[PDB]
Amino acid sequence: KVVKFSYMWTINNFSFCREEMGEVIKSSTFSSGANDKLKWCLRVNPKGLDEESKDYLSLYLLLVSCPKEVRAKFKFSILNAKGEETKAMESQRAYRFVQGKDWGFKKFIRRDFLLDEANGLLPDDKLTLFCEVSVVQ
């Protein structure tokens, strides 16, 4: 049966400079509970890692631990300055995860949408991402 859980990731000192931020950044690990040993993390490319996504921030869900079979649906959103879910993007189906496999969206959010202060998505250079994971595995 599906087990649904979530993780809120606050990235501090956010910068679009690859030489300061890194090409890839990763969150701490999370799971559905203290008893759940399957560990996940989020991975962000502050600038998309291919030509197609270069004007985007790319966001992925990564299975970190070695599962004892695993499939999961996922939904990513950005939390605004008021704390609300904005710019949600979700998988249409569950995908197969093995240790080290990621799934996500290379064009999750346009960089210039984040740099537009009216949207309130980078207050104090903190980017707050929220992931909801549905593991049917």
Partner: peptide
Amino acid sequence: ASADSTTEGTP
């Protein structure tokens, strides 16, 4: 929106 992966296949 269709999901992508940074790697080809599993795996």
